[PDB]
Amino acid sequence: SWEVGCGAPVPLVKCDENSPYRTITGDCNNRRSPALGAANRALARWLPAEYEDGLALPFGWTQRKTRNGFRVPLAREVSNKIVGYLDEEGVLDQNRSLLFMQWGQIVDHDLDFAPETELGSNEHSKTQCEEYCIQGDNCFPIMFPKNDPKLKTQGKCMPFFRAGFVCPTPPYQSLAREQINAVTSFLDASLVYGSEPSLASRLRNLSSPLGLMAVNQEAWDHGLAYLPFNNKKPSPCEFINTTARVPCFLAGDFRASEQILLATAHTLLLREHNRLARELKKLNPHWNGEKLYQEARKILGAFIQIITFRDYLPIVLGSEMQKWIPPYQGYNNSVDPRISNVFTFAFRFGHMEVPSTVSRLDENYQPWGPEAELPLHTLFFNTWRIIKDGGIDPLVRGLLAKKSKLMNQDKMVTSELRNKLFQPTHKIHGFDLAAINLQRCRDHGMPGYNSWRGFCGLSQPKTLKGLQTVLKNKILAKKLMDLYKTPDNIDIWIGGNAEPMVERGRVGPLLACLLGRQFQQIRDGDRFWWENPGVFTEKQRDSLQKVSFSRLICDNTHITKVPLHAFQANNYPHDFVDCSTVDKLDLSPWASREN
Ligand code: HEM
Ligand SMILES: *[C@@H]1O[C@H](CO)[C@@H](O[C@@H]2O[C@H](CO)[C@@H](O[C@H]3O[C@H](CO)[C@@H](O)[C@H](O)[C@@H]3O)[C@H](O)[C@H]2NC(C)=O)[C@H](O)[C@H]1NC(C)=O
Numbered sequence: 001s002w003e004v005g006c007g008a009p010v011p012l013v014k015c016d017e018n019s020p021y022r023t024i025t026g027d028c029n030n031r032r033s034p035a036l037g038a039a040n041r042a043l044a045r046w047l048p049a050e051y052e053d054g055l056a057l058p059f060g061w062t063q064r065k066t067r068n069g070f071r072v073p074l075a076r077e078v079s080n081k082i083v084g085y086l087d088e089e090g091v092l093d094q095n096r097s098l099l100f101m102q103w104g105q106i107v108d109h110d111l112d113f114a115p116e117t118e119l120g121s122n123e124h125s126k127t128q129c130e131e132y133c134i135q136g137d138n139c140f141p142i143m144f145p146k147n148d149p150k151l152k153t154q155g156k157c158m159p160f161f162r163a164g165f166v167c168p169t170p171p172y173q174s175l176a177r178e179q180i181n182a183v184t185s186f187l188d189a190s191l192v193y194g195s196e197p198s199l200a201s202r203l204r205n206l207s208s209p210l211g212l213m214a215v216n217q218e219a220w221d222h223g224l225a226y227l228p229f230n231n232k233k234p235s236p237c238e239f240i241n242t243t244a245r246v247p248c249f250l251a252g253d254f255r256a257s258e259q260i261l262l263a264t265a266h267t268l269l270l271r272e273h274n275r276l277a278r279e280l281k282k283l284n285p286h287w288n289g290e291k292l293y294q295e296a297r298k299i300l301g302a303f304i305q306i307i308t309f310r311d312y313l314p315i316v317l318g319s320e321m322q323k324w325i326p327p328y329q330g331y332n333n334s335v336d337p338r339i340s341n342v343f344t345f346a347f348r349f350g351h352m353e354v355p356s357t358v359s360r361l362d363e364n365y366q367p368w369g370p371e372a373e374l375p376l377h378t379l380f381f382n383t384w385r386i387i388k389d390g391g392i393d394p395l396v397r398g399l400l401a402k403k404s405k406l407m408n409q410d411k412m413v414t415s416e417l418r419n420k421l422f423q424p425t426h427k428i429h430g431f432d433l434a435a436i437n438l439q440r441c442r443d444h445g446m447p448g449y450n451s452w453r454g455f456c457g458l459s460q461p462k463t464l465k466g467l468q469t470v471l472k473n474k475i476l477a478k479k480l481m482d483l484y485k486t487p488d489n490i491d492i493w494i495g496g497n498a499e500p501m502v503e504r505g506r507v508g509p510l511l512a513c514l515l516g517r518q519f520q521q522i523r524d525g526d527r528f529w530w531e532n533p534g535v536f537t538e539k540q541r542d543s544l545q546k547v548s549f550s551r552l553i554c555d556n557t558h559i560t561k562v563p564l565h566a567f568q569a570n571n572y573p574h575d576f577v578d579c580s581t582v583d584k585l586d587l588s589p590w591a592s593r594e595n
C-alpha cells in the first residue's frame with residue numbers, strides 16, 4: 001500500500017530492553033518494532049487518506065474541485081444548521097454526572113494530540129491569516145456563510161492552521177500527508193508525566209530524591225498543591241484577566257489549562273502522584289528518587305486504565321461493549337497499538353456532552369456564593385478562578401453532583417462552545433468548536449461517512465429514505481442531505497454523532513465500532529497493560545481492582561461525602577456516603593525486603 005522507512009523527526013533513543021518501566025516517548029513497548037505506539041510519529045491509517053489532490057490538499061481547498069461530484073459545505077454552515085440550538089433547558093443527562101464528560105477528555109488527551117504547524121513567531125502570515133483570511137500554505141480559514149451573525153461582529157473568517165505532518169514540517173512534495181500524534185498511544189498517564197524527555201524532566205522535582213512532581217511555590221490550596229505555573233509569556237491565562245495576572249499551569253500535556261474543569265482534573269492527578277510517592281517512601285525508605293518516580297507513575301498508569309475500561313467504557317459503548325472489547329486474553333505483539341487518525345475525531349463525541357454552565361458547591365453541596373454558576377465560555381484558559389477564588393474542591397463537588405449534557409439530535413453542541421470558544425493564539429471568545437472539528441476532518445483527509453459505515457460492516461445509505469432509517473430521524477437526515485447532497489460526503493464527525501445511541505450507551509453503532517476497535521487494540525497491544533502477567537504481581541493486581549475515582553477524591557481533597565459510582569447521576573445527600581465507607585488502595589503489596 002506504501003513505502004517503509006520515512007521515520008525522520010524523532011528523538012531516537014536506545015531501548016533498556018529489561019526495564020520494568022515505560023519510556024516517556026513511548027518507544028520500546030513493542031520488541032520486534034520499537035517505535036510502534038511511540039510519540040511524534042504519524043497517526044495510523046486504518047483507511048487510505050482522502051485528499052483533494054490525493055496527497056496533501058484538503059477537500060474544500062480548491063473551490064472548483066468537488067468531492068464525488070458535489071461541493072463540500074462550509075464547516076461553519078454545517079454548524080449553524082445542524083449543530084446549533086438556543087434552549088439549554090432539558091438538555092441534561094439524567095444518568096451521567098459531569099465527571100462522565102470530564103474523564104473522556106482526560107482519556108483522549110492521554111491517547112492523541114495533533115499540533116498545528118509552527119514555522120511561526122514574529123510572523124506576518126499569522127496576521128495574513130487573521131486579518132485578511134487569505135488561504136495559503138498552512139492557513140486554511142473557516143469562512144462565515146451568508147447570513148452568519150459573526151460577519152457583522154468578528155470578520156470574514158476564523159483563522160485555522162493545518163495540523164503538523166511527518167518527515168519535514170515546512171513545504172514538502174513527496175507521498176501522502178500523515179498527521180503527527182505528539183503524545184504516546186498507550187493509556188499511560190502521558191498527560192501527567194509528558195511525552196518528551198525534556199518536558200518530563202522539567203516537571204520533576206530533582207532538588208529532592210523523594211521522586212515528587214514539581215508543585216507550585218506561589219500558591220497553595222489549604223495545604224494542598226497546585227500545578228506549577230508556566231514559564232512562557234505571552235500567557236493566554238494572563239490575558240483573560242489582565243488584572244489578576246495568573247499564568248496557565250504546566251502539566252504533562254499542553255492543553256492542561258484549556259478549561260477550569262480540565263485543569264481541576266489534572267491537579268487531582270498531580271496530587272495523587274505525590275501521595276503515592278511519599279506513601280511508597282514510607283514503605284520503602286531505601287528506594288531512590290528515580291524508583292519512587294517510576295513506581296508511582298506505574299500505579300497512576302494502572303489507575304487510569306482501570307477506571308477507563310471498568311467504569312467508563314461500558315457506559316459509553318453500552319451493549320456493544322462485548323462485541324468489540326471481549327475479556328482480556330493476554331498481550332498480543334501482532335496488534336497495532338497506534339492511535340488511528342479517525343479515532344481522534346471519533347472521540348470528539350465528548351464535545352456534545354459539554355454543558356453550558358459550570359458550578360461551585362460549598363460543603364453542603366449548596367451553591368458556593370453569589371456567582372456559583374458560571375457560563376462555560378468564561379472558563380477557557382481560566383486559572384485565576386481556581387487560585388484566587390476557592391480552590392478545586394467546590395469545582396470537584398460540581399463534577400459529582402451535577403450532570404453531563406445528553407447528546408441530542410436536536411441539541412448537539414452548546415453555544416458556549418459553538419460560538420464563544422477561546423483560542424490560546426488569538427484574542428476573542430468567538431471560535432466554533434464544531435466548525436474546527438469539521439474543518440479538521442478535511443484537514444486530516446478523512447474518508448466519508450459511508451466509508452466508515454462500510455469499514456464497520458454496517459449498511460451504507462445512498463438515499464434520503466435510507467439516511468432517515470439509519471438515523472431514525474426525517475428532519476435531521478433531510479438537513480444533512482441538503483448540505484452534503486450525498487451520504488458518502490457527510491464528514492465522519494457530524495455523521496457518526498448523528499446516529500441514535502446504542503442500548504445503555506452514549507454513542508451510536510458506528511462510533512461504538514471505531515472506539516471499540518481502537519480501545520481493544522491499545523489494550524491488547526500494550527505490553528505494560530496492568531492485567532498482563534509480570535507487569536504487576538497477583539497481590540498487586542488484587543489491590544488495584546479496588547480503586548475508584550471516588551477514593552481519589554477522598555485522598556486528594558477535603559471532600560468527605562462522595563458517591564460510590566461517580567459516573568452515574570447522584571443526588572445529595574441520598575447517594576453520597578462518608579469517605580470512611582469507601583474502599584482504599586492497599587499499597588502494602590508494594591513492599592520490598594532486603595535479606
Ligand atoms: C473546551 C473543550 C472541552 C470541554 C469544555 C472539550 C472536551 C472534550 C471531551 C469531553 C472529549 C472526549 C470525551 C474531547 C475530545 C477531543 N477534543 Fe475536545 N474539548 C474542548 C476543546 C477542544 C479544542 C479547542 C480542540 C482542538 C480542535 C482542533 O482540531 O484544533 C479539541 C480537540 C479534541 C480532540 C482531538 C485531539 C487531537 O488529536 O489533537 C479529541 C479526541 N478540543 N474533548
Ligand atoms: C443509571 O446508570 C447506572 C450505571 O450504569 C445503572 O446501574 C447499573 O445497571 C447495570 C445494568 O443496566 C448493572 O451493570 C452491572 O451489573 C453487575 C452488577 O451485579 C456487574 O457485575 C456488571 O459488570 C455490570 O456492569 C449494574 O447493576 C449497575 N451499575 C452500577 C455501577 O450501579 C442504572 O440502572 C441506571 N438507571 C437507569 C434506570 O437507567
Ligand SMILES: *[C@@H]1O[C@H](CO)[C@@H](O[C@@H]2O[C@H](CO)[C@@H](O[C@H]3O[C@H](CO)[C@@H](O)[C@H](O)[C@@H]3O)[C@H](O)[C@H]2NC(C)=O)[C@H](O)[C@H]1NC(C)=O
Nearest residue numbers: 240241242243244245246369370378383384385387388389
Ligand atoms: C479579574 O480577577 C480579579 C481577581 O482575580 C477579580 O476581582 C475580584 O472579584 C471580586 C469582585 O468582582 C472580589 O470578591 C469580593 O471581594 C470582597 C470580599 O473579599 C467583597 O467586598 C466584594 O464585594 C467581592 O464579593 C475580589 O476581591 C476581587 N479581587 C480583586 C483584588 O480584584 C475580577 O472580577 C476579574 N475581572 C474580570 C475582568 O473578570
Ligand SMILES: *[C@@H]1O[C@H](CO)[C@@H](O[C@@H]2O[C@H](CO)[C@@H](O)[C@H](O)[C@H]2NC(C)=O)[C@H](O)[C@H]1NC(C)=O
Nearest residue numbers: 204205206207208210212213214215216217228
Ligand atoms: C521539591 O521538594 C522539596 C522537598 O520535598 C520541597 O521543599 C519543601 O517545600 C515545602 C513548601 O514550601 C516546605 O514544607 C519546605 O520548605 C520544604 N521541605 C523540605 C523537606 O525541604 C519543594 O517545595 C519542592 N520544589 C518544587 C519545585 O516543587
Ligand SMILES: *[C@@H]1O[C@H](CO)[C@@H](O[C@@H]2O[C@H](CO)[C@@H](O)[C@H](O)[C@H]2NC(C)=O)[C@H](O)[C@H]1NC(C)=O
Nearest residue numbers: 328329330331332333334335336520521524525
Ligand atoms: C493477535 O492479534 C492478531 C491480529 O489481530 C491475530 O491475528 C489473526 O490471526 C487469524 C488466524 O487465527 C487470521 O485469520 C487473521 O488474519 C489475523 N488478524 C489480522 C487481521 O491480522 C491473532 O489471532 C492474535 N493472537 C492470538 C493467537 O490470539
Ligand SMILES: [Ca+2]
Nearest residue numbers: 110184186190
Ligand atoms: Ca498516552
